[PDB]
Amino acid sequence: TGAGTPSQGKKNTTTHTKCRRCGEKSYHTKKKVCSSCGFGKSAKRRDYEWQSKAGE
Template identity: 60%
Template sequence: MSKGTSSFGKKNKRNHTLCKRCGSMSYHKQKRRCSSCGYPEAKLRNPGSDKAIRRRTTGTGRCRHLKKSFRAFKAGFKGNEIVNKLKAKKD
């Protein structure tokens, strides 16, 4: 069995690689186009259905900032008011 030239012709399984823009393994090397976000087009690719939109919308990730915002909203955006009141009582 040859380890040389004839073996290299069979290395054609991977068509998709990492996309620079969206980070998914959807960038087609030969077409030079991402099947997920449409890179290198300027605008993002339109997800075809309602279900597809639900998969990638707000709330599907960690929501690092939004978590804090929701909590602050429930508390009435008090922030440091409570801390300042406690300091005032001590004086």
């Protein structure tokens, strides 16, 4: 079975959804954790220094 087009057919599972905390469609309803703001994992907001160029 091709890993391409034919394997795209079974994709009717919902995972990422609109987050209650940040509003981004990044709340993983299976994990109950937002990949965008960290809701469900961290009280503090998810943020990293690598989201921008080192000197900026």
